[PDB]
C-alpha cells in the first residue's frame, strides 16, 4: 500500500465525522452545527450540550449543512480549524485530505468554495472529494441502488458500473429531523410543552428525543391495512368463543419530569409511517413524496434495456443511514418489491457503522493507487482561476 496517511472528514447535514485513514473508527463525531454565544464566539463539539443546558440568552444554534447535504456557511465551516486543532491535532498543511452528496450536476460552485477553503485558507496539500452514495457502495459493489435515510430525508441514488446516474438521483424531504419534530409535537401535551429558540429545540433533539427514537418501529406493511386486518381478525377471536398486536404498550421514562410515557404499539408505528405516506400529516403532500413511490428513481434510471437496469439495481439494493436503523429494512423492501413484482430484490446493509457509513466509505483513502481518485492540487485551482 501507499506511504501516506489521510485526514478523512465527512460533513453530514446533522453529524460531522473526522479521523485518520490509518484506524478503523473516527476520532470524533461532532454536530454539524454550533452555538454562537455572545464580542462573538463559536462553540463546537457534542459535550461542549453543556452550553445548551446553561440556558443562556444570546446563545443560538446555527447549521453548516443545508438539506442538499451541502455546506452553505463557509466562514463557519472553516469547524475544520476546531477539528484539526483539538481532535486530530495536526497542521492541516501536512496530510492529504479526503472529504464527501449525489447531485443532478448543477451545484457541483461547490468545488470552488472547497478550493478556497482547502487552499486559500487552510493550506491543505491536496484533497479528494468522494461522492457519498458511491463510496458507501464501493466500501464491494460497483453498481447499486443506494437508499440513504438520514436526518435531512431519504436520498435515493442509482449507481451503475461505478458511475452515478445524476438524473435519477432523488432526495426525499422526510427523515430523521422530521421524526424529531413529530415525536415532539405528539408527546407535547404529556411533557407540558404544548430559529431564535434554537438552543432548546436542539438540546431536546440531542437528548430525550434521540433516545425516544432509538427505543419507534416501522410496521412491515401499510399500517392502515395492518389495522383493518388486526381488527377483522380480533372480531373473530372475540365472536368465535362467545389478541390484537397493536395494543401492546411501550414505556419510556421521561427524565426532565421523572415521568413515564406510555405508547401503544400502533402509536409507535405511526411516526415512521409518515416517511412512507406523508399525505397523512398534511393535505399538501402527495403520496408520491413518500419513500415508496420515490420507484420513480429506478424508472428514471431505466431512461439511462429498462427491464435490465431495473434488474441490476434491484439485485444490489443498499440500505444505509442512521434512521435506517429503526426497527422494521423490511418495509423499504416490501415497498420496493410491490412496485416491481417481476424482479427479485436482494438488499445489503451493514448490520452493525451505518450511522457513520458515509465516513467509513470515504475511509476505504486506503485505495492502493493515487490514480484511483481525482486529487485536486493547488495547481487545479490556479488553472481554474484563469479567465
Amino acid at each position: 500500500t501507499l506511504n501516506r496517511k489521510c485526514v478523512v472528514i465527512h460533513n453530514g447535514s446533522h453529524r460531522t465525522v473526522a479521523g485518520f485513514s490509518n484506524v478503523e473508527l473516527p476520532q470524533c463525531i461532532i454536530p454539524s452545527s454550533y452555538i454562537k454565544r455572545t464580542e462573538a464566539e463559536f462553540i463546537f463539539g457534542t459535550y461542549n450540550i453543556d452550553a445548551a443546558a446553561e440556558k443562556r440568552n444570546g446563545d443560538e444554534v446555527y447549521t453548516l449543512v443545508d438539506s442538499q447535504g451541502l455546506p452553505y456557511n463557509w466562514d463557519a465551516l472553516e469547524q475544520w480549524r476546531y477539528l484539526y486543532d483539538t481532535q486530530l491535532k495536526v497542521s492541516p498543511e501536512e496530510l492529504p485530505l479526503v472529504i464527501t452528496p449525489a447531485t443532478n450536476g448543477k451545484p457541483d460552485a461547490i468545488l470552488e468554495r472547497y478550493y478556497e477553503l482547502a487552499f486559500d485558507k487552510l493550506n491543505v496539500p491536496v484533497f479528494q472529494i468522494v461522492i457519498e452514495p458511491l463510496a458507501i457502495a464501493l466500501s464491494g459493489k460497483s453498481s447499486a441502488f443506494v437508499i440513504d435515510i438520514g436526518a435531512s430525508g431519504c436520498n435515493v441514488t442509482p449507481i451503475i458500473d461505478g458511475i452515478v446516474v445524476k438524473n435519477a438521483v432523488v432526495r426525499s424531504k422526510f427523515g430523521g429531523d422530521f421524526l424529531d419534530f413529530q415525536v415532539h409535537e405528539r408527546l407535547a401535551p404529556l411533557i407540558k410543552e404544548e430559529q431564535k429558540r434554537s438552543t432548546d429545540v436542539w438540546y431536546e433533539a440531542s437528548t430525550w428525543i434521540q433516545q425516544f427514537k432509538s427505543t419507534l418501529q416501522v410496521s412491515e406493511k401499510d399500517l392502515f391495512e395492518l389495522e383493518r386486518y388486526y381488527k377483522e381478525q380480533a372480531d373473530i377471536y372475540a365472536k368465535q368463543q362467545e389478541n390484537n398486536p397493536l395494543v401492546q404498550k411501550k414505556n419510556f421514562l421521561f427524565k426532565p419530569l421523572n415521568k413515564t410515557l406510555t405508547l401503544d404499539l400502533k402509536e409507535c408505528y405511526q411516526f415512521a409511517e409518515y416517511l412512507f405516506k406523508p399525505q397523512l400529516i398534511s393535505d399538501k403532500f402527495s403520496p408520491e413524496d413518500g419513500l415508496g413511490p420515490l420507484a420513480k428513481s429506478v424508472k428514471k434510471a431505466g431512461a439511462s434495456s429498462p427491464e435490465q437496469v431495473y434488474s441490476l439495481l434491484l439485485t444490489n439494493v443498499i440500505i444505509t443511514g442512521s434512521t435506517s436503523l429503526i426497527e422494521g429494512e423490511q418495509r423499504i423492501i416490501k415497498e420496493l418489491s410491490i412496485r416491481f413484482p417481476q424482479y427479485k430484490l436482494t438488499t445489503f446493509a451493514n448490520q452493525v457503522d451505518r450511522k457513520i457509513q458515509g465516513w467509513l466509505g470515504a475511509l476505504t483513502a486506503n485505495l492502493p493507487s493515487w490514480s484511483l481518485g481525482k486529487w485536486y492540487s493547488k495547481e487545479d485551482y490556479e488553472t481554474l482561476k484563469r479567465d
Binding site: 501516506r4 496517511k5 501536512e94 491536496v126 495547481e379
Partner: protein, 53 residues
C-alpha cells in the same frame, strides 16, 4: 557515559518526517510522511530517592 550505556544494551535504519512527492512523472503535490533515510541521511538520576519507603 549514558550514551555508551544505551549503545551497549539491547544487542538498523532511521526515518525522518518530511515532504514527499509521489509519482505516476511526479504528481504536482506534496505531503508529509515518514520516509526512510539513505545511507547518508547528559546525566543520571539515583533511584532509591524515588524508591518508596
Amino acid at each position: 557515559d549514558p550514551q555508551t550505556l544505551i549503545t551497549k544494551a539491547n544487542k538498523k535504519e532511521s526515518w525522518r518526517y518530511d515532504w514527499y512527492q509521489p509519482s505516476k512523472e511526479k504528481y504536482p503535490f506534496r505531503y508529509k510522511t515518514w520516509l526512510r533515510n539513505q545511507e547518508d541521511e547528559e546525566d543520571i538520576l539515583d533511584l532509591k530517592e524515588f524508591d518508596r519507603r
